Amino acid sequence: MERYENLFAQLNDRREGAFVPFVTLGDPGIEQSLKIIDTLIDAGADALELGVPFSDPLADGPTIQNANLRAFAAGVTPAQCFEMLALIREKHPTIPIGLLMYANLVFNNGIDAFYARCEQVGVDSVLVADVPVEESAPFRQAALRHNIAPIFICPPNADDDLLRQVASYGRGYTYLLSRSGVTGAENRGALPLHHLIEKLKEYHAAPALQGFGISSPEQVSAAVRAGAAGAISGSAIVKIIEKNLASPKQMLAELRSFVSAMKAASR
Amino acid sequence: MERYENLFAQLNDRREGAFVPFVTLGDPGIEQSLKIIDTLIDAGADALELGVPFSDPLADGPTIQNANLRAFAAGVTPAQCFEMLALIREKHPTIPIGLLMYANLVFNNGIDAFYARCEQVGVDSVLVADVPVEESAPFRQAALRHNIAPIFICPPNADDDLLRQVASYGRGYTYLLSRSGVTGAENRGALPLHHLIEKLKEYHAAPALQGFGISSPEQVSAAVRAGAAGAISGSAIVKIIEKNLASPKQMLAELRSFVSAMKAASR
Amino acid sequence: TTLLNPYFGEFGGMYVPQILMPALNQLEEAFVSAQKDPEFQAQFADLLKNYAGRPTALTKCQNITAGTRTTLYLKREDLLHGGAHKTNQVLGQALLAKRMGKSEIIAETGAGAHGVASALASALLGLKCRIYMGAKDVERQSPNVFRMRLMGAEVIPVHSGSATLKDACNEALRDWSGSYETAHYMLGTAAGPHPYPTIVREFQRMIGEETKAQILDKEGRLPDAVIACVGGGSNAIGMFADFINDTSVGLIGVEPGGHGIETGEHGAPLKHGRVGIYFGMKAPMMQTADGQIEESYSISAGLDFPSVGPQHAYLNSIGRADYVSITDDEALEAFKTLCRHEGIIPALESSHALAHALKMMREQPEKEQLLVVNLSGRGDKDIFTVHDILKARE
Amino acid sequence: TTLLNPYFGEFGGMYVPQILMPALNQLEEAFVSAQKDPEFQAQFADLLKNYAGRPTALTKCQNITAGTRTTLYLKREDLLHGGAHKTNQVLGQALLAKRMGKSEIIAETGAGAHGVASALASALLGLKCRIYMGAKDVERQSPNVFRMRLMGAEVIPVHSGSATLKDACNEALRDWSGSYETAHYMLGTAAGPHPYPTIVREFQRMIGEETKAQILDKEGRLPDAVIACVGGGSNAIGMFADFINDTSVGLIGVEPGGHGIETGEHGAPLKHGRVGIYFGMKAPMMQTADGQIEESYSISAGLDFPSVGPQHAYLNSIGRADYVSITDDEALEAFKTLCRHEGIIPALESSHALAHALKMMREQPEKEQLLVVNLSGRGDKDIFTVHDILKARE
């Protein structure tokens, strides 16, 4: 979790927000995914959010559903994703790496063993999309035992009790959901989140990253101006992968241009 | 009714049974039907049974269903059938003519008026196929008022009460049914009718003609040997019409050959 | 001679070939005997309750009468096992067939609901069932053909004439006249020769008896009118019978108007036909001037028949019951209305009765009136036909 | 925190994205409130009786147990309005949706019977209903698609994944997570996140309550066992609930064996799967060694799902209920048997339960045993699929 603490301190000193891309590990294949991730970092990503392909990602809309499918078509398994994570960490010693998991993949061979594997490869946080705070106990306990930040969601419909819980239990960053629904660049958030950002700060929550529907530089700026510590963008990044499958070269050039613009908006 | 009395007396003097063909009036058209009937008579028919085409002849099997249909396709109506009957009577003053009717055609414009028309054209009997003795009163009364023989059916399942009723109410001839079922040459009678023939005679019934399924000379002989006064054949005759529609010439030759053989069997 | 009166006024009788009179007499005697037999009554009651599911619900419409002074209940024969009121009297007639030592069943069917009822009763009670169905009806009521065949019944398409219910009826009677020693003719409506109109009424009368008790419990009074569609007359006589002596209760029968009475393409002989003799009975017929029986037409196979049962003709003649007509398009609108606003998919036959009730309400919306419609069956058999029609529109 | 226990032993829970927790909490509170509300209970009772037709018949088999010491009754949920037990709990959940001020309904469907139940309740009670259905199921259960559309519901084919019930379930939950302020998710089985397994049981428990009273009236004792097919678990928990404390009564649940357990093409996770977390619950899952959720298979769309409700997993774990499997071919034989020898056309789902009961009888024909099968629905939706299969054989 300390990689986040270090990042946010550096960003704060630089009066900067974080820009954090999401991609699915192994989409569209292992080699190309590794190059994709290198490009995201070189282009200015402050941290990564990395999905492990899952059969049934119920918080994800079509774009990221299709990313999961492409990874599966390439034969990608969680074991191979762990191999990939080791390679990423070996190249990039300081960048915070967060996994986007579904509960079954964490529970499957033992919750404790899962977080142990995360610690051994050098992952910094885990967000389990279909585990609400109410079911979080064995997950967050295992995470903290292995020096992994458990990432909690603060939804737009959060009450005070939830804000206090998230603030107390979470580490690394707090995930500030833009809106209801599932992942996707097509649906942009509607309701200002200023009040929630302020309360999280009052309760000493981990710094907030806004995510869901973030697809443009303007929205990155807006997240930061509203007081969030940065923003996450997934579907918008993945769409670039989708649209350029037949030109890996043009794929990387467009990812570089987009991330660089998205990062510039955080400054 | 007296034409039957005269016929049966002549036949008795000649130790002969009657052979009585059935056809549908107007099958396959008015002109050809008239020629057909002339041929039946010339070939030895002792009397005729003549159907008026009806929409729904529920005592008839496919062969005679199709005869009704052909007459309808030629536009034949009961009024035209009465015109035909006048022409037949004008040519043939002594032959007994019996109509095969369904109840609706008799009832339609008044039961009394129907039998009046029968008397005016010179018909001798009427059999109404879907009127059992239980419903016969207005029919048989109207028939007798107009000198028409009402033809009653004696089925193989007749009890003593029915034999007495048929014997008392009937005139002209008694219709001795070969079997259950509907008209058709394909199904031949099974059960000997000797007992019924004998009881009808005891009760002074009109002479019995056996009908249904009679298609061969042997069966004509057998009806007579069993004590019946003769036999009726319909489907077998109509089949000759059906099979030769495209050669009216060959049609008449085959009808002549068949009737002559059927009549020979009664001698 | 007979044990019971074969006529209702001038209508009815036994206009069959002589060969069939013993079978009719036998059936009448079996019926009269069974009606006095507590063991028969108990077996019948048991099947109706524990096998068919009686009593059926009486549902109050929640939505389709809003803004009017009509209260409309639907007698839910659509919930009976088999999906139509046809099941009630088939269970009684099947028991009669066994009482008479018959091993086989002949039935006609139009909508296929009587065919399904005959097949299911024959499967339960150990009879070998053959069903005549017009070839047009085989197509437009196809789901019922599948149901009958899966229950082991023989379905015989009839291509003759109009290839609809009349033609099936003709073939059933022709078969019976040659097979009656082994086969019972399980006629599916309150029509045909005596004793069928009487038996069918007596084996359907629980519809009106239950309705009366249900409306008395829910409303504390009799209905102003009970409304039923009229093919040969069974569901309507079943609903009417127990109310005949309650002179305040209107009895309204709805014949199919088809493409419109004025087109001649309809099935409404009671109001637009003339008395004649056909299918074993003296009753109103669609017929030509010179006495040929016409072909009928309705969108609904179950109402597509050019005659009507003799007790309806009688109740009309004395003015005890009133008969009206509803066109194909009116029936379709009522079908859609019930599906979309009450969540019940009705048979297209039953939709004629509903359409007239909705007209009674719409025409005089401030008239206070308590109405019951006999929802004679469910519309599963009709959904492909109807969907096709509506798609060709909407 | 919750008002009620979300777990049955280790199984159950609320494994949904955080965004949906307020909706689940709201539904739980509405349920707890409604359960104490005499007016809600009276409205529910009224719909169940006068609209859906409860109580349903309990039919004693006349033929299919001959020559054995088995007495077999069938609880006739096939006679409920809509044609399946699905209607009972949909009426309760629809009333909850209105209590919560929701105007729209989302439902998943496999067999289409829950989809039809959701559509009909929505038509009656004034809700705008959208139904997700896998594209394979749209074909093999086509009659239900016609019924839902004719009632005005929106049917959304799902082509993703296996294009069957699991895939519909995924799309329904994804939609709900973005529409919960206006739409209630009317989940059709005793599975998913709390409070659904609890609500669905409580709104189906009349099945077992009626069965108990009916068997006591007819036999003067409890059944030896009650047998029900198990998809997500609703009809079986509905039959089981009132007998759980009657320790002499066996509770037998039948999972689909598909092409055979050994083929991996089945839907029997309770006995051949491993606990996992999916669709809002910790429950037995068909899953790969590395924890991906598998696709299930059954001839019967209603049982074709790679998980099972948590109360069944719990009742199995403690040994209170026993679970078995029946293959496609066994289910088909039982379907044909009931059609041909009892005159009842069962849903292919319900045919799994019947097949196991007939095995219990055939395997030990001199064992005296009083059995009830929950005949969860009618087979109209299945007749084309089955006819096609049998034709390709017979």
Ligand SMILES: O=P(O)(O)OCCNS(=O)(=O)c1ccc(OC(F)(F)F)cc1
């Ligand atoms: O840009 P978008 O709209 O594609 O959203 C990006 C999301 N990728 S992610 O890993 O942050 C992410 C985070 C949380 C998710 O679900 C949960 F909120 F329920 F937990 C799912 C994905």
Ligand SMILES: O=P(O)(O)OCCNS(=O)(=O)c1ccc(OC(F)(F)F)cc1
């Ligand atoms: O030779 P087949 O088998 O064609 O029988 C010939 C019959 N033609 S008929 O006019 O005598 C004739 C006589 C009686 C009929 O029905 C009834 F018995 F019910 F009255 C029908 C036709």
Ligand SMILES: C=C(/N=C/c1c(COP(=O)(O)O)cnc(C)c1O)C(=O)O
């Ligand atoms: C002719 C048929 N059905 C008629 C029918 C009718 C009209 O027949 P009755 O007049 O005999 O009720 C009404 N409602 C339903 C559901 C029907 O199926 C038949 O199923 O063979």
Ligand SMILES: C=C(/N=C/c1c(COP(=O)(O)O)cnc(C)c1O)C(=O)O
């Ligand atoms: C999945 C569905 N049906 C399931 C079903 C089942 C199995 O579902 P439960 O385990 O929830 O009863 C049993 N019987 C019938 C008639 C069914 O339709 C559905 O209709 O959406």
Ligand SMILES: [Cl-]
């Ligand atoms: Cl690939």
Ligand SMILES: [Cl-]
């Ligand atoms: Cl913290």
Ligand SMILES: [Cl-]
């Ligand atoms: Cl011609």
Ligand SMILES: [Cl-]
């Ligand atoms: Cl005489």
Ligand SMILES: [Cl-]
């Ligand atoms: Cl009685």
Ligand SMILES: [Cl-]
């Ligand atoms: Cl067969």
Ligand SMILES: [Cl-]
């Ligand atoms: Cl009383």
Ligand SMILES: [Cl-]
């Ligand atoms: Cl309660």
Ligand SMILES: [Cl-]
């Ligand atoms: Cl719609």
Ligand SMILES: [Cl-]
């Ligand atoms: Cl009690």
Ligand SMILES: [Cs+]
């Ligand atoms: Cs009203």
Ligand SMILES: [Cs+]
């Ligand atoms: Cs009619």
